[PDB]
Amino acid sequence: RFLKVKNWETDVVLTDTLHLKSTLETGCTEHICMGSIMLPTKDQLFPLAKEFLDQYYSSIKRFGSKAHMDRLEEVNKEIESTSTYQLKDTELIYGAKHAWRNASRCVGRIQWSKLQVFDARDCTTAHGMFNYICNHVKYATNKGNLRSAITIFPQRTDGKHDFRVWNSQLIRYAGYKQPDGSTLGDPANVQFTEICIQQGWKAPRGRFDVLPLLLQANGNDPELFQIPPELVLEVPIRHPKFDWFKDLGLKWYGLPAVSNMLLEIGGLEFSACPFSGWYMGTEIGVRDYCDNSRYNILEEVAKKMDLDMRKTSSLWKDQALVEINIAVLYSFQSDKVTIVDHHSATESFIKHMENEYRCRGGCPADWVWIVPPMSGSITPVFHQEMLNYRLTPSFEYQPDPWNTHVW
Amino acid sequence: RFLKVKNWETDVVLTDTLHLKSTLETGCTEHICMGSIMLPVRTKDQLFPLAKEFLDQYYSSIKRFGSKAHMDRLEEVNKEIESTSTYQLKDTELIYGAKHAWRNASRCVGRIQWSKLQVFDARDCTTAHGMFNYICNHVKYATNKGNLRSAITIFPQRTDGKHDFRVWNSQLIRYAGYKQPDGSTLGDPANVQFTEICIQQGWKAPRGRFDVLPLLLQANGNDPELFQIPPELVLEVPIRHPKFDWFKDLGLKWYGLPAVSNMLLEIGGLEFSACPFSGWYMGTEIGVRDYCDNSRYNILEEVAKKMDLDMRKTSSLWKDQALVEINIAVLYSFQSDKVTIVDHHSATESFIKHMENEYRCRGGCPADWVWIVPPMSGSITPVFHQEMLNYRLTPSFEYQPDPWNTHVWKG
Numbered sequence: 067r068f069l070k071v072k073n074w075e076t077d078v079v080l081t082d083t084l085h086l087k088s089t090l091e092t093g094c095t096e097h098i099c100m101g102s103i104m105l106p107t108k109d110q111l112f113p114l115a116k117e118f119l120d121q122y123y124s125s126i127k128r129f130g131s132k133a134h135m136d137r138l139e140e141v142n143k144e145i146e147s148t149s150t151y152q153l154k155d156t157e158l159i160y161g162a163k164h165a166w167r168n169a170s171r172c173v174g175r176i177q178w179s180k181l182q183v184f185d186a187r188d189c190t191t192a193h194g195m196f197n198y199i200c201n202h203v204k205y206a207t208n209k210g211n212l213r214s215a216i217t218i219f220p221q222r223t224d225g226k227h228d229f230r231v232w233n234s235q236l237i238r239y240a241g242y243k244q245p246d247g248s249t250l251g252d253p254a255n256v257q258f259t260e261i262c263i264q265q266g267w268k269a270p271r272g273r274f275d276v277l278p279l280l281l282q283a284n285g286n287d288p289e290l291f292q293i294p295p296e297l298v299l300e301v302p303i304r305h306p307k308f309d310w311f312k313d314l315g316l317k318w319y320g321l322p323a324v325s326n327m328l329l330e331i332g333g334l335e336f337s338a339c340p341f342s343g344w345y346m347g348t349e350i351g352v353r354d355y356c357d358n359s360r361y362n363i364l365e366e367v368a369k370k371m372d373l374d375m376r377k378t379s380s381l382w383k384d385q386a387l388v389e390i391n392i393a394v395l396y397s398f399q400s401d402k403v404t405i406v407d408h409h410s411a412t413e414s415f416i417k418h419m420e421n422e423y424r425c426r427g428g429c430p431a432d433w434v435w436i437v438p439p440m441s442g443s444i445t446p447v448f449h450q451e452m453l454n455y456r457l458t459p460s461f462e463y464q465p466d467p468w469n470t471h472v473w
Numbered sequence: 474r475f476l477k478v479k480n481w482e483t484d485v486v487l488t489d490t491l492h493l494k495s496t497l498e499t500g501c502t503e504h505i506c507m508g509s510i511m512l513p514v515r516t517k518d519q520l521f522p523l524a525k526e527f528l529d530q531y532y533s534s535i536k537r538f539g540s541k542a543h544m545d546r547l548e549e550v551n552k553e554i555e556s557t558s559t560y561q562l563k564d565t566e567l568i569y570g571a572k573h574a575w576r577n578a579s580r581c582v583g584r585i586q587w588s589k590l591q592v593f594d595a596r597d598c599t600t601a602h603g604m605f606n607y608i609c610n611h612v613k614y615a616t617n618k619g620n621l622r623s624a625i626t627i628f629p630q631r632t633d634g635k636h637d638f639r640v641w642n643s644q645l646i647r648y649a650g651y652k653q654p655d656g657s658t659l660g661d662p663a664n665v666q667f668t669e670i671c672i673q674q675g676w677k678a679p680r681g682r683f684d685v686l687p688l689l690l691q692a693n694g695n696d697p698e699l700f701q702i703p704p705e706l707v708l709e710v711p712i713r714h715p716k717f718d719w720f721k722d723l724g725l726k727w728y729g730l731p732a733v734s735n736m737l738l739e740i741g742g743l744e745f746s747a748c749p750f751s752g753w754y755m756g757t758e759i760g761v762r763d764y765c766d767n768s769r770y771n772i773l774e775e776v777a778k779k780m781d782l783d784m785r786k787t788s789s790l791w792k793d794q795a796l797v798e799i800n801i802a803v804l805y806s807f808q809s810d811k812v813t814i815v816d817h818h819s820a821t822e823s824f825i826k827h828m829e830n831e832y833r834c835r836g837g838c839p840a841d842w843v844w845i846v847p848p849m850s851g852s853i854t855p856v857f858h859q860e861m862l863n864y865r866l867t868p869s870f871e872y873q874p875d876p877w878n879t880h881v882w883k884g
């Protein structure tokens with residue numbers, strides 16, 4: 067019930083006590099570990115509010131104070147009466163920053179306290195949503211000098227009036243299945259693109275078409291908006307040594323921005339809360355470019371490199387993977403767009419974990435996600451034991467809205 | 474109940490019912506997942522149900538469940554337990570149990586091979602000298618001049634825990650590590666403590682970078698004794714690279730036979746505390762972990778220097794570049810010497826076909842994703858994208874504490 071984690075490279079042992087405050091369930095039991103599974107009213111609301119306000123007032127050294135008691139007081143009266151409550155600005159910013167601090171799959175949490183929070187709780191239409199998201203995108207992009215941000219739309223009320231961004235990230239490329247049988251563009255986005263054409267988008271039918279946003283205000287049917295083209299910073303991918311690389315015609319966008327998660331703070335649920343930081347190079351160069359079900363380019367790059375593709379044991383895939391990843395990092399750095407390589411990011415995460423252990427008594431961390439998808443054991447996180455558990459405030463996965471929406 | 478796992482690359486979904494047979498615990502709870510934690514004297518009482526569970530599995534596997542033969546065997550074991558407090562396995566039961574401990578080993582990517590395992594029954598062994606002879610014969614049979622064959626040698630079971638057989642080596646073949654007064658290490662830093670024990674026990678250390686360690690063997694709870702494996706039985710591979718002619722001059726070599734000797738084999742509640750087992754290497758074990766871990770031979774620097782990579786910024790990915798070349802070299806070397814080895818692409822692809830077969834015929838395949846995914850290039854292997862359920866089935870292999878921590882020295 068007080069637990070140790072050991073680093074097997076360095077022999078450092080840390081004691082975790084923060085897990086005792088874990089709220090939600092993990093999916094695991096005493097009999098089965100589900101560590102690799104991607105997706106494992108008034109009465110309930112008052113304890114969630116209390117738990118949250120206690121942690122808030124504690125964080126500002128005023129736990130137990132008259133101002134603490136008066137606030138539980140007020141939120142209590144407000145729930146009783148209105149059956150929900152409204153967070154104060156300060157509470158909303160604290161909640162959002164802690165939802166990131168608590169994101170156990172996120173390697174970049176050393177940054178967690180430097181998060182610009184945009185309060186869009188006064189938004190009422192999808193046009194208003196579109197405006198807020200363009201401003202978020204412009205602020206966060208900052209001409210390539212990226213800054214972390216979140217934009218928080220109104221909280222769920224009765225569940226019939228949800229705000230949702232239908233897109234999974236604010237910026238993604240379209241996918242279209244061909245007469246050919248194959249797929250042009252990103253195969254991850256084929257279903258979403260169909261909904262877009264079906265809601266009226268005029269698809270340019272190219273390999274790298276930025277999808278339009280599909281926004282849902284107050285439970286209405288979602289509407290389509292194109293992000294101003296000049297606000298989507300993209301990077302053409304070249305290689306520092308291979309002049310033929312540019313000829314593949316690859317590009318990626320600078321801003322990773324998740325838009326389908328649910329932010330939960332003191333029992334309140336913010337179903338549209340797009341957030342963004344900056345990329346770790348492997349995300350584009352290993353996953354986006356090299357997954358077999360994504361742009362799947364390994365074979366072309368290997369062929370251009372003239373490697374022996376006859377046998378798996380020449381490690382042609384591995385060789386080409388490294389080159390692709392050198393090209394991503396080089397292209398972002400040349401164009402001065404913030405990016406971090408997986409060595410430097412995971413080293414920061416170990417420093418972060420030590421800080422959180424020391425100052426907070428723990429850091430929930432999901433090893434399956436924190437260890438990079440290439441070169442795992444040459445990053446320090448591979449060697450680091452991690453305990454995974456769920457603290458609130460949190461970001462939660464929620465089902466695709468086209469499955470929920472009644473039109 | 475049914476549990477589902479999905480492959481995110483293929484959309485294949487599998488349904489697991491086998492987890493309903495697990496009883497041992499995971500370390501996890503509804504509140505904490507310990508899936509990345511490395512490590513998360515029995516009464517007649519507990520023993521008969523364990524024996525019964527095993528014999529029932531064994532008899533079902535031979536299509537004789539509930540037979541007279543089955544009922545007779547239960548009766549026999551039952552009487553033996555209450556008369557002598559333990560029992561002895563038949564040879565057929567021992568073979569079945571050892572094959573199943575491998576099939577159940579959720580951290581093992583090589584399990585497509587589980588039903589091909591040569592079992593050496595060393596239960597008539599009584600002394601450390603006899604253990605040495607048996608382990609030499611295992612080495613020679615398993616090596617097979619480079620055409621490696623899986624095998625396991627099983628020493629007598631635990632009785633009161635005061636008479637245990639133990640191999641003190643963590644693997645049958647490993648290199649010595651010596652800590653120098655300046656704080657540097659010569660040879661394999663993973664084996665420094667064990668090397669010091671050997672030297673203390675009277676081993677005359679060559680003090681080179683690749684000295685094969687002597688066996689340190691404990692029979693019947695006695696003080697352990699040192700033995701050197703005949704060097705002609707230790708097959709080694711000098712490591713060279715197919716295009717880089719300077720790679721040979723790094724002076725690297727490795728041994729061909731990976732042979733775990735510190736684990737405990739549990740079969741129907743009996744504990745085999747000395748049960749060395751061996752297969753063949755996946756290239757990354759040597760080329761990623763043994764050579765490139767910072768706490769092991771740690772050669773990335775020197776390799777990238779010779780490749781003249783840009784080393785001033787990690788973002789040149791120099792470490793990744795040198796990593797791939799080292800791994801090509803390990804595989805090229807073993808292949809060129811006709812020593813069995815498997816690359817991580819072939820091995821994971823075979824593993825996925827084994828896992829799907831297991832789901833169809835057995836209702837599941839417990840698998841530890843943290844260990845199954847290779848330590849380089851994880852997501853270009855198909856296991857990265859495969860959801861896995863980890864749970865504990867018996868017969869099984871378990872970790873045990875190192876014997877120098879628990880041994881009562883007789884002197």
Ligand code: HEM
Nearest residue numbers: 166169171172173174177214215341342343344345346461
């Ligand atoms: C600032 C730089 C950041 C870096 C380098 C970074 C790094 C990453 C990486 C590599 C992942 C895994 C993504 C994947 O495999 O698809 C991730 C996941 C995540 N990060 Fe971050 N992060 C950053 C900022 C943020 C911010 C600003 C937030 C929230 C405010 C956030 C919350 C999350 C969440 C919730 C996940 C899990 C996403 C999912 O389940 O799909 N991160 N982080």
Ligand code: HEM
Nearest residue numbers: 575578580581582583586623624750751752753754755870
């Ligand atoms: C035949 C070829 C085999 C291959 C290619 C193979 C592959 C591997 C690999 C790569 C690991 C991880 C090793 C590590 O990270 O240190 C491993 C773990 C393991 N394998 Fe195998 N395996 C093989 C045969 C065997 C055999 C014959 C047995 C037992 C009869 C066995 C039982 C295990 C066990 C118990 C582990 C976990 C080891 C531990 O916790 O340290 N495997 N397997």
Ligand SMILES: Cc1cc(N)nc(CCc2cncc([C@@H](CN)Cc3cc(C)cc(N)n3)c2)c1
Nearest residue numbers: 104235322323324341342343344345346349463
């Ligand atoms: C804020 C942020 C920063 C940063 N550097 N990178 C990101 C990546 C976000 C992301 C981009 N594409 C895909 C994803 C995937 C999981 N790889 C989304 C996903 C899918 C599924 C099935 C489950 C789940 N929890 N998450 C996530 C976000």
Ligand SMILES: Cc1cc(N)nc(CCc2cncc([C@@H](CN)Cc3cc(C)cc(N)n3)c2)c1
Nearest residue numbers: 511644731732733750751752753754755758872
């Ligand atoms: C039979 C077999 C086949 C094959 N291809 N490879 C092997 C390798 C075995 C091995 C070699 N060095 C080191 C190990 C380590 C864990 N990396 C032993 C270990 C350490 C710790 C702390 C825990 C644990 N369960 N196991 C295991 C064995």
Ligand SMILES: C[C@H](O)[C@H](O)[C@H]1CNc2nc(N)[nH]c(=O)c2N1
Nearest residue numbers: 102103104434435857858859860
């Ligand atoms: C099945 C497995 O959980 C799934 O492939 C995971 C593995 N680790 C991951 N790690 C990160 N960072 N992102 C991911 O999408 C995944 N996918």
Ligand SMILES: C[C@H](O)[C@H](O)[C@H]1CNc2nc(N)[nH]c(=O)c2N1
Nearest residue numbers: 448449450451509510511843844
């Ligand atoms: C802390 C973490 O569990 C540890 O480094 C693990 C990760 N995965 C591994 N996987 C294999 N095959 N062998 C190992 O030693 C490890 N070590």
Ligand SMILES: [Zn+2]
Nearest residue numbers: 094099501506
């Ligand atoms: Zn778990």
